[PDB]
Design a binder for this molecule. Structure first.
Ligand SMILES: CN1CCN(C(=O)c2ccc(F)c(F)c2)CC1
Ligand SMILES: [Zn+2]
Ligand SMILES: [Zn+2]
Ligand SMILES: [Zn+2]
Length: 459
């Protein structure tokens, strides 16, 4: 049990308005044949165009919702909608493109998928709420065969060109006209009562139905994300390295140590309530503070209500000392907090669009995060950048330009001249900090926080 068997049954009830008279009894093997594709008993890495829910989850980065709406098909033009917001009109002769023949529509489809996916995945997964026209339109822009490699590199082939008889990955497909060996999954096979809008609208109020094909495509991928990452959570699945994952995670650990250590030095709280990951470890092991842990897994649906995380009868007096919410998404943080909250609006290769304003952050594991809400931070302020160090000024062991900065909180800067060691360390920390902020993380602190209070930790 690795791939989806072609002899698995496919419910055809969702297809019978576009395809009247369709057999109730149907397998993937028969459906693929009906779509105009011949699989030829091929044992070459592509056993089925359709995939299991588990395989779709492992390839979430490849997901592109796809819907085809009859404009008037063979006699009628088709509207092709994608979860990128694109709408193309194909003639058989929110981006709305006028009616053009399939030979130019297919070139645009290869361009769009390659630009959307080259930095995310090695394939495309067409996410459907299948009614008929999308499955029968695939023959016009999809070619299938054995698994192949790119003509310009070692990556797997995702495109094909009839002009040159060659294959390409998403990075080298300029001028290619066919999508090669795409994958697909029909959300209607998952057991749903009612149409797409009624099921989507149960969990999401951000995507509307402007009665256009790309709207349905967006709603379909959104519903597929809710089922696989919001109401079902599997944090065991590992995902490939596609960007700055390692630098981002390292920066987050450095920033956490720095910020918490400085808060403990400046305000000397007697107790720290660490609320979040049940696997968390003391980020400042040398601090005198009474460190107390509270377990709460990452919320994927709605942000935690502070009343449920805290109240209902632990020091119990969460008002005493400071609360650390490191990636613990709550509706309204208490005033005595140190907070790291992922901004779901961030544009990046790690952050995929999610359900109800939320986003799916994929860095080693998939974490659907609830919508970023500025009101959660009303009792706090934005934590300003600063670098603090009590380590000795000693070079040991990269050229130099004298560093001058009001945010380099060290003994050497206090004594009017930053040493080479704290200047290298300051610049490295500033880079780690910028990496974290650019990845989408936002830092928030109690209003009494003042880096001026750190200078006296040097006597
Ligand atoms: C005389 N000491 C005792 C109390 N003290 C700490 O508790 C402390 C140590 C290291 C840290 F990183 C930190 F955040 C806090 C610093 C001053
Ligand atoms: Zn290539
Ligand atoms: Zn939605
Ligand atoms: Zn120094």
């Amino acid at each position: 049990p690795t791939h989806l068997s072609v002899d698995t049954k496919f419910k055809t009830e969702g297809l019978c308005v576009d395809i009247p008279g369709i057999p109730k009894d149907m397998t993937y093997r028969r459906l693929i044949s009906m779509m105009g594709f011949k699989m030829n008993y091929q044992v070459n890495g592509y056993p089925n165009m359709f995939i299991t829910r588990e395989e779709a989850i492992r390839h979430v980065r490849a997901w592109i919702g796809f819907d085809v709406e009859g404009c008037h098909g063979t006699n009628l033009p088709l509207q092709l909608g994608f979860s990128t917001g694109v709408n193309l009109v194909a003639v058989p002769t929110p981006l709305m493109y006028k009616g053009l023949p399939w030979n130019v529509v297919r070139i645009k489809i290869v361009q769009m998928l390659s630009d959307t996916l080259k930095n995310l995945s090695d394939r495309v997964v067409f996410v459907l709420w299948a009614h008929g026209f999308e499955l029968t339109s695939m023959k016009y822009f999809v070619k299938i065969g054995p698994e192949r490699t790119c003509c310009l590199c070692d990556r797997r082939a995702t495109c094909f060109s009839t002009a040159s008889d060659t294959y390409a990955c998403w990075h080298h497909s300029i001028g290619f006209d066919y999508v090669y060996n795409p994958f697909m999954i029909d959300v209607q096979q998952w057991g749903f009562t009612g149409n797409l809008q009624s099921n989507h609208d149960l969990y999401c109020q951000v995507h509307g139905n402007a009665h256009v094909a790309s709207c349905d495509a967006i709603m379909t991928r959104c519903l597929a994300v809710h089922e696989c990452f919001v109401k079902r959570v599997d944090w065991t699945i590992e995902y490939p390295i596609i960007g700055d994952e390692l630098k981002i995670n390292a920066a987050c650990r450095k920033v956490q140590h720095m910020v918490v250590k400085a808060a403990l030095l400046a305000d000397k709280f007697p107790v720290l309530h660490d609320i979040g990951n049940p696997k968390a470890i003391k980020c400042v092991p040398q601090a005198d503070v009474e460190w107390k842990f509270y377990d709460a897994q990452p919320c994927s649906d709605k942000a935690y209500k502070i009343e449920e995380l805290f109240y209902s009868y632990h020091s119990d007096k969460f008002t005493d000392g400071v609360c650390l919410f490191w990636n613990c998404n709550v509706d309204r943080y208490p005033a005595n907090s140190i907070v790291c909250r992922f901004d779901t609006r961030v544009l990046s290769n790690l952050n995929l669009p999610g359900c109800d304003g939320g986003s799916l952050y994929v860095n080693k594991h998939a974490f659907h995060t609830p919508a970023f809400d500025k009101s959660a931070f009303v009792n706090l302020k934005q934590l300003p950048f600063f670098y603090y160090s009590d380590s000795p000024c000693e070079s040991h062991g990269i050229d130099y330009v004298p560093l001058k900065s009001a945010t380099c909180i060290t003994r050497c800067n206090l004594g009017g001249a930053v040493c080479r060691h704290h200047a290298n360390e300051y610049r490295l920390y500033l880079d780690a900090y910028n990496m974290m902020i650019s990845a989408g993380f936002s830092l928030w602190v109690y209003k009494q926080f003042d880096t001026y209070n750190l200078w006296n930790t040097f006597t």
